[PDB]
């Protein structure tokens, strides 16, 4: 049908279309306009309905600047929520929120598959019992804080301490050993990361599969809100239609609440909490709940998430933090030591396998590791105050082994091959546990500490020590 514009209110837009047969909530309306005379300005705009009003008026939100909108101009309604283009054809390019590629390498054909963004979460019927652990191929992650597939992961790491290297390695491993593809959706600052990912993941070829979606701070509130949901619809296509054993990734959750900070400005309604929208928990939940495992296909939408807010008691970080499953921390002081990845023994949950299923050895090893690290920390405190030489023999042996344990944590990443020159190593979780057990058992107390660096397996440590000409 066709309806005319009657009101404009800037960012909230509040275009009150007068129409014959109204479109449902979340439906898409597209405006086409031409410069009939010198005064008028041609504009092509898309809007999303958000609220019905008295008589025929339907409130909307515009995804771009409304400068040049004139009362009386005709509007056409598409018939369905804003349709992202998705499928094989769309793989391998960077999109805006609406669906056009920002880089002008190519244009998506009209014939392609287009799916609506807003979909109800998977029913309770299709869910699956979740006990299994996803393998990351990173020794520390597989030893201290494993990730439950289908669950949200948190990584509290400052920019420049290895965030980009860590996520590149994760997506490379998940595309090398698994059938999983990744999806990235940023909202903040500058995307210099585009060229780093271009280098490594285009050498790997995964760039052709990862369908990045970008809309950043310069965009109006509506696009900054709906970008994450476009990113999620990218994964939803794979899980529903493809149904491959693709345990895919999506790399942003909290950024939706960072955009929700601006969604509070998008509302234009009664304030609540600390200026936040009333529907904060519901609005975040609608996104978070679409990430699930399922029996329709072997697709776990497990996501690694960075939280820029980093304030505990604030309502939005608390509401987001309630949904998180596992947590990890990246700190600069550990980066100083040359131990990479710079992850510390902080962990969360991940007990679905160990010790729940059997997991006895894994759980006991992890507990001993954390205990030894904290004992080494207090011993290091004592050493500075008075001196190590006065420590007893049995207490000194703890530091002796702790040095090796601390240094073994480093892993020679595959992505680092283009800078360091190391080919890179992938480790199975069982191999990590089995190999590390001997370290706690003191099989290799005599070996020099420097051998325990940037190696995948314990035999590699032994051979490196040998190569040092012992």
């Amino acid at each position: 049908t066709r309806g005319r514009v009657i009101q404009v209110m800037g960012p909230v837009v509040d275009v009150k279309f007068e129409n014959g047969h109204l479109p449902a909530i979340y439906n898409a309306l597209k405006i086409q306009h031409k410069a009939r005379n010198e005064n008028e300005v041609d504009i092509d705009l898309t809007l999303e309905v958000a609220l019905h009003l008295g008589d025929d008026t339907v409130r909307t939100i515009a995804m771009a600047s409304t400068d040049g909108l004139i009362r009386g101009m005709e509007v056409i309604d598409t018939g369905a929520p804003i349709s992202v283009p998705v499928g094989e054809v769309t793989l391998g390019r960077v999109f805006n929120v609406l669906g056009e590629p920002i880089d002008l390498e190519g244009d998506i054909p009209a014939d392609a598959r287009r799916d609506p963004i807003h979909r109800p979460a998977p029913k309770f019927e299709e869910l699956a019992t979740e006990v299994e652990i996803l393998e990351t191929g990173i020794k520390v992650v597989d030893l201290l804080a494993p990730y439950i597939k289908g669950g949200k992961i948190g990584l509290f790491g400052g920019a420049g301490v290895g965030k980009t290297v860590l996520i590149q390695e994760l997506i490379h491993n998940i595309a090398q050993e698994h059938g999983g593809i990744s999806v990235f959706a940023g909202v903040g600052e500058r995307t210099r990361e585009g060229n780093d990912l271009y280098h490594e993941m285009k050498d790997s070829g995964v760039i052709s599969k990862t369908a990045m979606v970008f809309g950043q701070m310069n965009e109006p509130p509506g696009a900054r809100m709906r970008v994450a949901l476009t990113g999620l619809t990218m994964a939803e296509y794979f899980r529903d239609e493809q149904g491959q054993d693709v345990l895919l990734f999506i790399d942003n959750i909290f950024r939706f609440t960072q955009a929700g900070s601006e969604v509070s400005a998008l509302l234009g309604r009664m304030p609540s909490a600390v200026g936040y929208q009333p529907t904060l928990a519901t609005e975040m939940g609608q996104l978070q709940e679409r990430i699930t495992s399922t029996a329709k296909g072997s697709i776990t939408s497990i996501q690694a998430i960075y939280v820029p807010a980093d304030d505990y008691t604030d309502p939005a970080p608390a509401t987001t933090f309630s949904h998180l499953d596992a947590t990890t921390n990246l700190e600069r002081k550990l980066a100083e030591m040359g131990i990479y990845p710079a992850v510390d023994p902080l962990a969360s949950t991940s007990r679905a396998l160990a010790p729940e299923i059997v997991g006895e050895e894994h759980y006991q090893v992890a507990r001993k590791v954390q205990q030894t690290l904290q004992r080494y920390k207090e011993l290091q405190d004592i050493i500075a105050i008075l001196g190590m030489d006065e420590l007893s023999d049995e207490d000194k042996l703890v530091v002796h082994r702790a040095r090796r344990i601390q240094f073994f944590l480093s892993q020679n990443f595959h992505v680092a091959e283009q800078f360091t020159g190391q080919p890179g190593s992938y480790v199975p979780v069982k191999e990590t546990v089995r190999g590390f057990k001997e370290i706690l058992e003191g099989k290799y107390d005599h070996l020099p500490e420097d051998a325990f660096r940037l190696v995948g397996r314990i035999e590699e440590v032994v051979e490196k020590a040998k190569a040092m000409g012992v």
């Binding site: 009101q7 008028e40 300005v41 600047s65 400068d67 950043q216 400005a265 200026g275 820029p308």
Partner: protein, 475 residues
């Protein structure tokens, strides 16, 4: 397309009629004052007034213009002082309009930029050696009130005489007499050859205050797109933020966390994202920006400072206690960082200025302890002496930008230990006498630094500084 004003008050009028008005279109009254239409209700228009609203009366006729908030740009504006609406302020006749462009345009997007690798010299030894800045980078400057923010900005604009740059200085809510003083201080030193100054003083209505930085960045963007490098300085964004708050409150929009509405992060980030380093496909332009933010009681943790600091690529923090104590300029290493720095900095400075940072930090900590405790070890005392000389070198006087080559040479002389013999107060005399000696003896070193961008022949530099020590007279 004619209408009548039906309500007036504190700068926000309303009008009846104007069928074909376009949101954001410039509108004008029989009085001649310009207005920006912002809200279009079903039968009446909400107009924000840009000018004196006292003359307006209900029943006044209002006329639309047909332009969407266009600000004139051109070559004529260089050296002038203009209003955000583009009107001349300093007399000297009307400026010629090459072309008119809106101020609501989209920022340069992703995959259309490039990593920053080109240096921008401020002329201050401490800044250029410790916290470099690159072209296209956004560096925020924060400090306590009366700490020299404007002095640093004027030093940067003055030093930019040598290197091709179009500098635009935006005065937001600043006192008019200070604006005129800065205008004259730029008239001397010839800085008005390239600089454009945009002013909207405290007396101006809040809409003009919040519109000014947008107009300045819009003016700079034209030279960006033609290919010329630009350096824009906002004297104080806090005035824009406050003027925004006031307009929203008068329009009855509910406040956010503080009295500020929720929009302010979008408002300021839309402004700051518009500065970018372009790629070869788009002409390779650049727009550096150096925003300023006011700090009360030296407490960084606040709504506006964190809100803006989340946007920029780095920041520099100036302490008032050090400044008043006699350390001018004063920067704290702990709070000041530049994330884009290191790639723009020329290799010569990168090689020369490695140990200076560690010396400054370690010495300052040790000096704190020493003033706490008298008794010390000999190595700590030698470190204290070196740090004292280092502090003496870093001092710089007013309105005297120093060329990079003399900076790297004097930093080399400081770090190698040649300067250590000179007493504290004699260090400054040593520095200026060494500049004169460099002008006298070591010209080839300076030319090799200019052309090569790398440290010159080290042996001859050692001989030259040794010869200066042999000629210099202590005390």
């Amino acid at each position: 397309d004619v209408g009548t004003v039906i309500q007036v008050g504190d700068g926000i009028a309303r009008a009846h009629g104007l069928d074909n008005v376009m949101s954001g279109e410039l509108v004008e009254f029989a009085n001649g004052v310009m207005g920006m239409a912002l809200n279009l209700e079903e039968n009446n228009v909400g107009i924000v007034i840009l000018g004196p609203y006292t003359g307006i009366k209900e029943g006044d006729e209002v006329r639309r213009t047909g332009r969407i908030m266009e600000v004139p740009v051109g070559e004529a504006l260089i050296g002038r002082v203009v209003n955000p609406l583009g009107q001349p302020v300093d007399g000297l006749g009307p400026v010629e309009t090459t072309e008119t462009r809106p101020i609501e345009s989209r920022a340069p997007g992703v995959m259309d930029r490039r990593s920053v690798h080109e240096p921008l010299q401020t002329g201050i030894k401490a800044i250029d050696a410790l916290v470099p800045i690159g072209r296209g980078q956004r560096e925020l400057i924060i400090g306590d009130r009366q700490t020299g923010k404007t002095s640093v900005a004027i030093d940067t604009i003055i030093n930019q005489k040598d290197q091709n740059m179009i500098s635009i200085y935006v005065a937001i809510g600043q006192k008019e007499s200070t604006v005129r003083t800065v205008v004259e201080t730029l008239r001397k030193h010839g800085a008005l050859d390239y600089t454009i100054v945009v002013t909207a003083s405290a007396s101006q209505p809040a809409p003009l205050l919040f519109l000014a930085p947008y107009a300045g960045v819009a003016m700079g963007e034209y030279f960006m797109y033609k290919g010329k490098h630009v350096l824009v300085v906002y004297d104080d964004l806090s005035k824009q933020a406050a003027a925004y708050r006031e307009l929203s409150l008068l329009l009855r929009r509910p406040p956010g966390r503080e009295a500020y509405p929720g929009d302010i992060f979008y408002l300021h980030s839309r402004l700051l994202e518009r500065a970018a380093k372009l790629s070869d496909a788009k002409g390779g332009g650049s727009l550096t920006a150096l925003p300023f933010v006011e700090t009360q009681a030296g407490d960084i943790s606040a709504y506006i400072p964190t809100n803006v600091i989340s946007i920029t690529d780095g920041q520099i923090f100036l302490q008032s206690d050090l400044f008043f104590s006699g350390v001018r300029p004063a920067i704290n290493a702990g709070l000041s960082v530049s994330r884009v720095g290191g790639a723009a900095q020329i290799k010569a400075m990168k090689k020369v200025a490695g140990t200076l940072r560690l010396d400054l930090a370690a010495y300052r900590e040790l000096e704190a302890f020493a003033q706490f405790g008298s008794d010390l070890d000999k190595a700590t005392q030698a470190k204290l002496a070196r740090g004292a000389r280092t502090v003496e070198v870093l001092k710089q006087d007013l309105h005297q930008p120093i060329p990079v080559e003399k900076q790297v040479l004097i930093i080399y002389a400081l770090t190698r230990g040649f300067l250590d013999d000179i007493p504290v107060e004699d260090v400054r005399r040593f520095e200026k006498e060494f500049y004169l000696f460099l002008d006298q003896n070591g010209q080839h070193l300076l030319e090799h630094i200019r052309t090569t961008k790398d440290l010159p022949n080290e042996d001859d530099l050692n001989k030259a500084i040794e010869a200066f020590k042999k000629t210099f007279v202590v005390s």
